[PDB]
Swiss-Prot record, chain B:
ADP binds at residues 198, 236-244. Phosphorylated on at least one threonine residue and on Ser-29 by SERK1. Belongs to the AAA ATPase family. It is found in: Nucleus; Cytoplasm, Cytoskeleton, Phragmoplast; Cell membrane. The gene is CDC48A. Homohexamer. Interacts with SERK1, GRF6, KAPP and SYP31, but not with KNOLLE. Component of the SERK1 signaling complex, composed of KAPP, CDC48A, GRF6 or GRF7, SERK1, SERK2, SERK3/BAK1 and BRI1. Interacts with PUX1, PUX2, PUX3, PUX4, PUX5, PUX7 and PUX11 via its N-terminus. This is Cell division control protein 48 homolog A. Probably functions in cell division and growth processes. Interacts with certain SNAREs as part of specialized membrane fusion events where vesicles from the same organelle fuse (homotypic fusion). The modification Phosphoserine is found at residue 29.
Length: 761, 332, 232
């Protein structure tokens, strides 16, 4: 089996599907099909055909024959590619045009920017010389290019007869009647689509199967005897993808789309907001199938505790009544968008309303890369821009932030060219304008000068850490496999033996021994999402979103199953219940303790969700967290031993320029009782010393050359500046253990007597 | 490399750029260019020229010749310096005036404070004695000084024909028709500019590249394939520079500027605040390129938790809708 | 006349140089590596495949010149310097609330390169009380936890260094010493015989001192005196 969630997105290869390719002819009403492809299509040489494009756009052209066109090719020209909205490499479908429909009229009008420089009737110069007796097929809404000399005027197919498409026979009596098709109309063409949304595939698949399927193929649901949900609610960080995704789905499904912007509704006088809502719903019902996208729904339907006026609760109630009135099932779907899912009134998040919710969260590396590719598809990038590096460096960047980053890169490119650009002149040199290209350094500078927005939001992603990055801890990994991986990859195994596992683990040990890394590594092994939460972050949550922060992170973990919810730095929240119970500063630790235990109680029934903790202070850890049904498994992470420290050094220096004479194993003997953090700080000090050394070396070399320029560039060239043993010796000189010999036997004692904390002392 | 952030502010020295200098003559419609500078400019002795000043202010004068004028000098008189808004040491540019445009009428009116003590028709005492057959170039909106005895009356070029600038030929039939050009009109002249803002260069450069470039040279952004940001938000300690900088940039970029003061919007009855906002945005769109400076925006768009009434959230929502409606990119 | 914007955070390059600071040669030498090199030469660390640390803590006797070192290192790198004191942070919560620490950190982000200095950690960084409780210290707990949260998100900004200073290292919260936070620990000692001469000279670098005054003579007699005492 496989994960069939992302199955609707898959394109089903068919004999009628041909890949896009360049044509041997620039004819706009004629393409060229390979003879074999035509035979599969039952077509013949020079036969009109309908090409199915993207965004519900299609054109009509006569297919020729040529053996150079490989089987998975169609050989269309640039104009057809633009009309279909398909770039090279897309997979269009081909259908026949048996009804050639020799048209009596083919209304043709020009575009203003393609007419600049025409001093004669366009009908007698462009249209008639190429259409009369040519029998060129024409598809309404497609821009065919024409030439009548030096100027090239492109006309849109305004109004054919038949209306859809026809063939331009000699009987087509028509001329150019005015210029009403100015180029600015392109703002509503090629606007949005599936290809314009990147970084979301699971959410996009969910939206498509909840919106497009009920509206295009309701027969499936009717036969299965299930009524599909009518309420969808997109939510996520501001600027992520919501309004784009809604419009993309609406345009791709080809259903009547009505946008109800919250500010627009609330900016009108009382009695017009409700009137507009009623009109929108009525029009959607009349023109079914339909979609009603309510952007910024939080403004028109905020939490009832926050809304003050009566003409706001009235609008909320009107919206609720209208949604309740949609149970007629007139192929109408109401989709929402709100960055504040909790700010929404609870009534909306109910059956018969917005009951199905999709979280358009922060994208991962591949998503950011795809977003950047989408946004830079039009910019004049140079041949040395590496978007992979930028995507790796852009952590916490939503799509809007990436678009702003591209814009800032372009601006920085302009600033570099400001020296050769004079602002006083009302016009800029054309050659200078066309020679501006965005380089990688511009992007790096823009990224340095740009800041992320969704850097505080919880991130649900598979960590990149593997077992290799962690040195030693073989037994800990061996037991973690049983505790986590087996009940996830093989859940039925436990049911086979009639015994359920435990969904809780606690890591206790000296600081810097690799407790945070183990959680990420085990998540990576099981390919399960990882949610990182720190005690300091939890403590500020109560002074803020309040009760709905811990509940929210746990709900997110539930929605993201399988998951590994890690609570680092339990030393603060899990502080043992004070004997003199009191205070509000610790009244937040008591909250993040009791409310957290309450959620732990309800989490054992979810399955495939494991709650892992980490504490450097097992003495103060609340004994309640150790209860069965909670973090009861206790795993001790010891200080690395002689063998483990070699692995730790190697991992810390797995990508370092270390010299050939450095004995990694030698340091292990001298560094005993040092945590992994100290072992990494040793390497950091060594790297800093090497940087100092090679900085001084390069400075001395350049100063030697400048102290008599006649001195030529000798064979001496900048070297690796590898980390010599001297640097490591100097680092070990200042290196100091972060765990004392008196603070290890105590950890051993707690390893012995930790779970006994639920009783007396 | 260098920090190219403060690059737009830099003035690009050009052969047409001359530094300001005192003139050997007090003539207001005549300056004096060094012969070599004229040769670089392809000008000749006694040729009308357009001088590009600051704050979108320029004058027209006939350039003479003199060897005492160093190459980086223009030798303009005090009146020309005042009209151009340029003090000594500024770097103006020089353009030719091939269309001398001998004008049929040169409307001239006086200023009240320069007329105190005149007991005769100003046309027969100041204008005609110095304009008839003098062929003095005149630029609309420039105050040229004249004398008809002891009193010195300075007149503004009210309405020339052609409207922009012309040469005062003998055929210029005109007299002083009233005194509608009282000196108090100077409150709206030489008001604000880049030189009137000090202590901010990085912020000023950012504002200029985010506002003036998209409005004057959108070709760069269009070719690069990037849509420039339309929303800018100045913030800082009260009284620092905000309202001054906004007006300075608006006047220097020479685009239709509309000021929407928050208190003024909120001081009106319900249904007039939103009406005024809509009118402002519509007028800005009509007269593109344009700028819509919303001072004290916090009053009309405060935090929703703090606002209590409905006719305030309505204004906030109207503003949000109007800004969302600006994606048409009409150079606004 | 009185100023108005005297309470607002100021983002400017300090005028203090290494000369105004007497002695501390080793401290300056290590601060160069810790701060200047990852700023002037950021690509150097990427060349060796190892990232630096954006945190430092100054602990030592009062009056030994911990505040001056931060300003001096900012001046050397020509980076903006933001000065924040624990007493100021404690009143922020009783006020702008959550959006004061977030705001100063955002300002530091916008002003990169920057050196965000937290003087007087003796108050905010008071060690988490065993009997956790109270709202007077519920502000120290806020300025501690909320500050650590911001420190966590600051390591990805680059060219922003967070420096602390504490005269009470005993009570300093152990969380601030974590990697990814103020983990580098630099000890500022009491000036020695040689350092005190430099301190006197700096304090009197623009003074009318007579021709018979032996600056070095005082150094011997003043032992154990902090720089503040030498200036007094
Ligand atoms: N996944 C994406 N792929 C491509 N472009 C994107 C993507 N996400 C965002 N963008 C771009 O960024 C813009 C901002 O996203 P938008 O769709 O307005 O977000 P939003 O969630 O509706 N914002 P708000 O209502 O202010 O919280 C889009 O209009 C695109 O130009
Ligand atoms: N076993 C290990 N192998 C390799 N590197 C390690 C190991 N243990 C610690 N380190 C390094 O030291 C850093 C700190 O350890 P970490 O994994 O964060 O432990 P922790 O228990 O979260 N520490 P703390 O929060 O300070 O109590 C890691 O991110 C690694 O860089
Ligand atoms: N940088 C500057 N250069 C010259 N004059 C200045 C400068 N900044 C302020 N001024 C003067 O001080 C006045 C007050 O500044 P103003 O532009 O009104 O500040 P503001 O930020 O708009 N005030 P508020 O809206 O009350 O917070 C200006 O009108 C000038 O007269
Ligand atoms: N090394 C030094 N060289 C010169 N002057 C010094 C030195 N150390 C201290 N001083 C002087 O003493 C003053 C106080 O020292 P400062 O640099 O503020 O230390 P601090 O650690 O901030 N003190 P405190 O906040 O009282 O614990 C300085 O501003 C100087 O005037
Ligand atoms: Mg939206
Ligand atoms: Mg931990
Ligand atoms: Mg103001
Ligand atoms: Mg201090």
């Amino acid at each position: 089996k496989k994960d069939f969630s992302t199955a609707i997105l898959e394109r089903k290869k068919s004999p009628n599907r041909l890949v896009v390719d360049e044509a041997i002819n620039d004819d706009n009403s004629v393409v060229s099909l390979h003879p074999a492809t035509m035979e599969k299509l039952q077509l013949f040489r020079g036969d009109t055909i309908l090409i199915k494009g993207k965004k519900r756009k299609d054109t009509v052209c006569i297919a020729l024959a040529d053996e150079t066109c490989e089987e998975p090719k169609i050989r269309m020209n640039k104009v057809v590619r633009s009309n279909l909205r398909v770039r090279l490499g897309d997979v269009i479908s081909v259908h026949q045009c048996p009804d050639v429909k020799y048209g009596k009229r083919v209304h043709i009008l020009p575009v203003d920017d393609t007419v600049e420089g025409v001093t004669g009737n366009l009908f007698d110069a462009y249209l008639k010389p190429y259409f009369l007796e040519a029998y060129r097929p024409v598809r309404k809404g497609d821009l065919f290019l024409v030439r009548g000399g030096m100027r090239s005027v492109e006309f849109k197919v305004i109004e054919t007869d038949p209306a859809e498409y026809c063939v331009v026979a000699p009987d087509t009596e028509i001329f150019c009647e005015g210029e009403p098709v100015k180029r600015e109309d392109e703002e509503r063409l090629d606007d949005v689509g599936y290809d314009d949304v990147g970084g979301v595939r699971k959410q996009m698949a969910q939206i498509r199967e909840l919106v497009e399927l009920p509206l295009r193929h309701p027969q499936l649901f009717k036969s299965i005897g299930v009524k599909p949900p009518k309420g969808i609610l997109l939510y996520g960080p501001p600027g992520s993808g919501k309004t784009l995704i809604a419009r993309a789905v609406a345009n791709e499904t080809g259903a009547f789309f009505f946008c109800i912007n919250g500010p627009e509704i609330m900016s009108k006088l009382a009695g017009e907001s409700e009137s507009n809502l009623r009109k929108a719903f009525e029009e959607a019902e009349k023109n079914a199938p339909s979609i009603i996208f309510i952007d910024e729904i939080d403004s028109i339907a905020p939490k009832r505790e926050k809304t003050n006026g009566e003409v706001e609760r009235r609008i909320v109630s009107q919206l609720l009544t209208l949604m309740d009135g949609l149970k007629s099932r007139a192929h109408v779907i109401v989709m929402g968008a709100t960055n504040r899912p909790n700010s929404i009134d609870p009534a909306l998040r109910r059956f018969g309303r917005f009951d199905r919710e999709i979280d358009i969260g922060v994208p991962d590396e591949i998503g950011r890369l795809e977003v950047l590719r989408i946004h830079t598809k039009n910019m004049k990038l140079a041949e040395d821009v590496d978007l992979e590096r930028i995507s790796k460096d852009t952590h916490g960047y939503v799509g809007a932030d990436l678009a702003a980053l591209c814009t800032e890169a372009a601006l920085q490119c302009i600033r570099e060219k400001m020296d050769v650009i004079d602002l006083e002149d009302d016009s800029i040199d054309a050659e200078i304008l066309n020679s501006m290209a965005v380089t990688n350094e511009h992007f790096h500078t823009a990224l340095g000068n740009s800041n992320p927005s969704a850097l505080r939001e919880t991130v649900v992603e598979v960590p990149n850490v593997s077992w290799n990055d962690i040195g030693g801890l073989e037994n800990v990994k061996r037991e973690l496999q049983e505790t986590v991986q087996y009940p996830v990859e093989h859940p039925e195994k436990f049911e086979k033996f009639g015994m359920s596992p435990s969904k809780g683990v606690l890591f206790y040990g000296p600081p810097g021994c690799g407790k945070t890394l183990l959680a990420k590594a085990i998540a990576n092994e099981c390919q399960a999402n990882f949610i990182s939460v720190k005690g300091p972050e939890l403590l500020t949550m109560w002074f803020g979103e309040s009760e709905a922060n811990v509940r929210e992170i746990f709900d997110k973990a539930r929605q993201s199953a399988p998951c590994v919810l890690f609570f680092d730095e339990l030393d603060s929240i899990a502080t043992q219940r004070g004997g003199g119970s009191g205070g509000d500063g610790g009244g937040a630790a008591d909250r993040v303790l009791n409310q957290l235990l309450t959620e732990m109680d309800g989490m054992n029934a979810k399955k495939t969700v494991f709650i892992i903790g980490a504490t450097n202070r097992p003495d103060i850890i609340d004994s309640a967290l150790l209860r069965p049904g909670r973090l009861d498994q206790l795993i001790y992470i010891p200080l690395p031993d002689e063998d483990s420290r070699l692995n730790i050094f190697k991992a810390a220096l797995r990508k370092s320029p270390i010299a050939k004479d450095v004995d990694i194993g030698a340091l292990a003997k001298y560094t005993q009782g040092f945590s992994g953090a100290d072992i990494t700080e040793i390497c950091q000090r060594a790297c800093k010393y090497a940087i100092r050394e090679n900085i001084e070396k390069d400075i001395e070399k350049e100063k030697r050359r400048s102290e008599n320029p006649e001195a030529m560039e000798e064979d001496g060239v900048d070297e690796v500046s590898e980390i010599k043993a001297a640097h490591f010796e100097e680092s070990m000189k200042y290196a100091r253990r972060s765990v004392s010999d008196a603070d290890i036997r105590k950890y051993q004692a707690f390893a012995q007597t930790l779970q006994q904390s639920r009783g007396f002392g």
